[PDB]
Amino acid sequence: MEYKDTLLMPKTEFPMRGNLPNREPKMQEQWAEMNIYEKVQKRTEGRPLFVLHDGPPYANGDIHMGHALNKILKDFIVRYKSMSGFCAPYVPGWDTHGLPIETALTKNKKVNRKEMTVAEFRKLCEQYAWEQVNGQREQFKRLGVRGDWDNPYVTLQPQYEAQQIKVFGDMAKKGYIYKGLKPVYWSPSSESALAEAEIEYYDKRSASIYVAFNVKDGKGVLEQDEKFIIWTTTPWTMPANQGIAVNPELQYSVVEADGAKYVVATELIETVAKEIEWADYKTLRTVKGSELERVVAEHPIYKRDSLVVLGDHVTTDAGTGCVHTAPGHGEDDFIVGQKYGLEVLCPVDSKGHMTNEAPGFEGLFYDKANKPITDKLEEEGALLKLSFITHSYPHDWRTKKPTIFRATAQWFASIKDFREDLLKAVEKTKWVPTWGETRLYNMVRDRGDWCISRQRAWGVPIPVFYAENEEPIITDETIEHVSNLFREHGSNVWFEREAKDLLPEGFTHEGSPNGRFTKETDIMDVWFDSGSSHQAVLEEREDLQRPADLYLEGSDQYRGWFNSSLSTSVAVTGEAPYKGVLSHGFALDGEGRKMSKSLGNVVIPEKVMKQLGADILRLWVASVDYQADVRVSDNILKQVAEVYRKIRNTFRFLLGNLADFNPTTDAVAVEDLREVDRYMLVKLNKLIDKVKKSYDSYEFSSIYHAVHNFCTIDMSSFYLDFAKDVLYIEAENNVERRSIQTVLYETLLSLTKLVSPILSHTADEVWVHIPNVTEESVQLVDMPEVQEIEGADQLVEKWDAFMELRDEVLKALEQARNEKVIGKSLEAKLTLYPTADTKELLASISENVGQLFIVSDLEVAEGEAPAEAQKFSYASIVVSKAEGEKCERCWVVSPTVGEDQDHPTLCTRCADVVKNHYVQQ
Ligand SMILES: CC[C@H](C)[C@H](N)C(=O)NS(=O)(=O)NC[C@H]1O[C@@H](n2cnc3c(N)ncnc32)[C@H](O)[C@@H]1O
Ligand SMILES: CC[C@H](C)[C@H](N)C(=O)NS(=O)(=O)NC[C@H]1O[C@@H](n2cnc3c(N)ncnc32)[C@H](O)[C@@H]1O
Ligand SMILES: [Cl-]
Ligand SMILES: [Cl-]
Ligand SMILES: [Cl-]
Ligand SMILES: [Cl-]
Ligand SMILES: [Li+]
Ligand code: NA
Ligand code: NA
Ligand code: NA
Ligand SMILES: [Zn+2]
């Protein structure tokens, strides 16, 4: 009214309190209406392509915080490359087959796969799949992820299944596919084989056994009174024993007497004495391990022949130098068993129950038969000691129940035949973090052959036929026919036709003169479905190319997608399907614990999406070291939300006091700018260069703090703080405020473009309040390009010292605020006693120091009288009262108030501004 003369923040069109949860959905509505993904893709249609191939998440259910972190990090890279001279097509995907879907339906929906036909259960899996891919798609959109959502890929599509058969066929033609009876992981709960990617390790309690094997034929080395000692944590494997293993040359065993003579490795005498609790024991003689070859022993229960074998797998670290060898339940046992032609015995069926191969324990679950086995061992007297240990044990990745080794006929990919090319691909790939290279390298050099056959329904069947010779039929014509047949009708055609209707129209094989063929029923590993994505997506789709330039998935994918995709591509191409890998850790609670509902620490993405919003989560992703494990909690997100509050206030302030400025022609030249403004221009360009470099190096934590530092202290507390009382009081065409707001315009234009990859809900919201809008959204322009500023280094040194000195002056003002006598900064007059260095810097100031320090008046003298006021290390300061008339407009205490007859209550500055008009008003 009479006290105020406007000159406030006009543009409140950007609200202060951020109600993103109710505003962001409307923001996404306009993005979908304009089809912004197609716009940026069309704009960069001729630019070089940077492909970030999306790892297909499972459709097991709704998204968790880990899903969001994956997509948000992908969105950061794609958005930056879209507006940095690259074409960045991003198509989502979904891994649809496998146990993650069957187990979800079986447990949650209480359906029984054995109460319905295979076709019916597969149809139910297909229904639940599309339900989840639709639900996950909308949840990703709410987060604010840009991509080809209307045209994604799923693993159940016939085109994908057709190409996956081609991938399998190409490897088979190379000779990398074979079938054999080998021990592999078995899940009795799922009644199927498994691989390491389908295995989770948990601590499990197992019974430790020290058992004795009697000697029948010592071959002139041992008498019948000696007995071998065996340590085993798997009692159920005893009925399958066919031999005993000992190290031939490196380890020499001895005979120990504790009332009876036992055979044990020499280096384990003390360790075996404390376990069996021997009282008095004496060594008889020493025998080299190789001398014990072909010694015949007896089974403690069945008294069958057990052949002592030589192998390098037996170690001193075990409980005894002799190891029970069961070729049907162990990798190393199978290898040595085949070396000596030992029988392969697997008395355990697919459901984990003992079969007729174990006479005294038939029908028992393997874990439930451990106690009866020990009881029979103790009845025979061969049991020495029984104990219990807890150790990490493999478990099914879906049923969470333990797995066992079973020797069964399975399909394998011969990794050993091209392991060298796999190692070369890892060495030629760029890994971020760096340890990822050694992570996958060692996983390959120590990997065995990959079991790819699964005894389940929901998946892609293995395209192998069998003739009357029972010879597997794999050839390019059969592979081509089934691939085209799958492309038309899908994988369902395999489960609804006999073999002769799935073959070429006139195919005949030598092994079956009658033309009577049969088909395979096992399906492929779900990791093979995802590992064929590069051939079916990067190669088949025209919008993408192979190899992709980056893979971005979690740390668990080194066993999974990173490994399987490399295996299929190097088998076919010989080269890696990716030029680089970016790895992110897992999401944890505030105390570094797994987010499980059991702990009650789950941070639901939808929970944060509605309580806080999307850009808050986007900042949180950029606020953490994703490359390692990340910890999240509601309190942490509130801190991130508070940071967004400071960012939002700075943007509102920048938009507000910039309203009365049109930079179309009111642009102040760089030479005409204030040296104070020129320093901010240098700082802005340094910020642009650092942010763009950080995007290239993928260091988002640097961007998060750099922007936070640039706004909280550098701009809002130092530069905008001065402009809070200078911009609007002066004339609206004054070169001072016009030049300052050219800097504000440059910051607003550049910062809005910089933040666009990380935050877009607020970036486009600010982009609306831009005087010069040549593109509909901020995502349609490129990132700002750094521009050199003349005399930058000299001004950086000068004004960084000036910033330091101002902070000390503010500290002196805050000391006066502690006194609260003046209780004001602008009204206070200053008498300064600077150091020669400080005095030289003040002399170099060509601007008004009074307005910079937001003080009424400043005088400089070498009084050198400290009194009791203050003295900074570079200047002595006195905060004095001016005692003049206070202006009613600028609030500056100035003696000039009253000199103007028309405005006796205004100073000369305010009186001149009020009286004079530039051209109008
Ligand atoms: C199937 C029953 C559960 C696993 C039960 N918690 C249980 O067995 N708990 S335990 O503490 O006995 N676990 C010991 C492990 O060793 C086996 N075991 C237990 N008692 C004996 C025994 N007397 N002789 C041989 N093996 C035995 C169990 O199968 C379990 O894996
Ligand atoms: C590339 C994806 C694989 C082929 C597989 N479908 C898969 O892992 N599917 S998933 O849906 O379970 N996971 C997809 C991505 O999410 C990561 N992830 C899973 N759980 C978490 C977690 N708790 N914290 C952080 N990231 C996590 C996976 O590593 C993968 O990148
Ligand atoms: Cl089941
Ligand atoms: Cl063992
Ligand atoms: Cl048929
Ligand atoms: Cl058939
Ligand atoms: Li707070
Ligand atoms: Na049913
Ligand atoms: Na079969
Ligand atoms: Na089957
Ligand atoms: Zn005034």
From TrEMBL:
<keyword id="KW-0648">Protein biosynthesis</keyword>
<dbReference type="GO" id="GO:0005829">
    <property type="term" value="C:cytosol"/>
</dbReference>
<dbReference type="InterPro" id="IPR033708">
    <property type="entry name" value="Anticodon_Ile_BEm"/>
</dbReference>
<dbReference type="InterPro" id="IPR002301">
    <property type="entry name" value="Ile-tRNA-ligase"/>
</dbReference>
<feature type="domain" description="Methionyl/Valyl/Leucyl/Isoleucyl-tRNA synthetase anticodon-binding">
    <location>
        <begin position="677"/>
        <end position="830"/>
    </location>
</feature>
<dbReference type="InterPro" id="IPR010663">
    <property type="entry name" value="Znf_FPG/IleRS"/>
</dbReference>
<protein>
    <recommendedName>
        <fullName>Isoleucine--tRNA ligase</fullName>
        <ecNumber>6.1.1.5</ecNumber>
    </recommendedName>
</protein>
<keyword id="KW-0547">Nucleotide-binding</keyword>
<dbReference type="InterPro" id="IPR009080">
    <property type="entry name" value="tRNAsynth_Ia_anticodon-bd"/>
</dbReference>
<feature type="binding site">
    <location>
        <position position="910"/>
    </location>
    <ligand>
        <name>Zn(2+)</name>
    </ligand>
</feature>
<keyword id="KW-0067">ATP-binding</keyword>
<comment type="similarity">
    <text>Belongs to the class-I aminoacyl-tRNA synthetase family. IleS type 1 subfamily.</text>
</comment>
<dbReference type="InterPro" id="IPR050081">
    <property type="entry name" value="Ile-tRNA_ligase"/>
</dbReference>
<dbReference type="InterPro" id="IPR023585">
    <property type="entry name" value="Ile-tRNA-ligase_type1"/>
</dbReference>
<keyword id="KW-0963">Cytoplasm</keyword>
<feature type="binding site">
    <location>
        <position position="887"/>
    </location>
    <ligand>
        <name>Zn(2+)</name>
    </ligand>
</feature>
<dbReference type="GO" id="GO:0002161">
    <property type="term" value="F:aminoacyl-tRNA deacylase activity"/>
</dbReference>
<feature type="binding site">
    <location>
        <position position="553"/>
    </location>
    <ligand>
        <name>L-isoleucyl-5'-AMP</name>
    </ligand>
</feature>
<dbReference type="InterPro" id="IPR001412">
    <property type="entry name" value="aa-tRNA-synth_I_CS"/>
</dbReference>
<dbReference type="GO" id="GO:0008270">
    <property type="term" value="F:zinc ion binding"/>
</dbReference>
<keyword id="KW-0862">Zinc</keyword>
<dbReference type="InterPro" id="IPR013155">
    <property type="entry name" value="M/V/L/I-tRNA-synth_anticd-bd"/>
</dbReference>
<dbReference type="Pfam" id="PF06827">
    <property type="entry name" value="zf-FPG_IleRS"/>
</dbReference>
<dbReference type="InterPro" id="IPR009008">
    <property type="entry name" value="Val/Leu/Ile-tRNA-synth_edit"/>
</dbReference>
<feature type="domain" description="Aminoacyl-tRNA synthetase class Ia">
    <location>
        <begin position="27"/>
        <end position="633"/>
    </location>
</feature>
<keyword id="KW-0030">Aminoacyl-tRNA synthetase</keyword>
<feature type="binding site">
    <location>
        <position position="597"/>
    </location>
    <ligand>
        <name>ATP</name>
    </ligand>
</feature>
<feature type="binding site">
    <location>
        <position position="890"/>
    </location>
    <ligand>
        <name>Zn(2+)</name>
    </ligand>
</feature>
<keyword id="KW-0436">Ligase</keyword>
<keyword id="KW-0479">Metal-binding</keyword>
<feature type="short sequence motif" description="'HIGH' region">
    <location>
        <begin position="57"/>
        <end position="67"/>
    </location>
</feature>
<dbReference type="GO" id="GO:0006428">
    <property type="term" value="P:isoleucyl-tRNA aminoacylation"/>
</dbReference>
<comment type="function">
    <text>Catalyzes the attachment of isoleucine to tRNA(Ile). As IleRS can inadvertently accommodate and process structurally similar amino acids such as valine, to avoid such errors it has two additional distinct tRNA(Ile)-dependent editing activities. One activity is designated as 'pretransfer' editing and involves the hydrolysis of activated Val-AMP. The other activity is designated 'posttransfer' editing and involves deacylation of mischarged Val-tRNA(Ile).</text>
</comment>
<dbReference type="Pfam" id="PF08264">
    <property type="entry name" value="Anticodon_1"/>
</dbReference>
<dbReference type="GO" id="GO:0004822">
    <property type="term" value="F:isoleucine-tRNA ligase activity"/>
</dbReference>
<dbReference type="GO" id="GO:0005524">
    <property type="term" value="F:ATP binding"/>
</dbReference>
<feature type="binding site">
    <location>
        <position position="907"/>
    </location>
    <ligand>
        <name>Zn(2+)</name>
    </ligand>
</feature>
<comment type="subunit">
    <text>Monomer.</text>
</comment>
<dbReference type="InterPro" id="IPR014729">
    <property type="entry name" value="Rossmann-like_a/b/a_fold"/>
</dbReference>
<dbReference type="InterPro" id="IPR002300">
    <property type="entry name" value="aa-tRNA-synth_Ia"/>
</dbReference>
<dbReference type="Pfam" id="PF00133">
    <property type="entry name" value="tRNA-synt_1"/>
</dbReference>
<feature type="domain" description="Zinc finger FPG/IleRS-type">
    <location>
        <begin position="884"/>
        <end position="913"/>
    </location>
</feature>
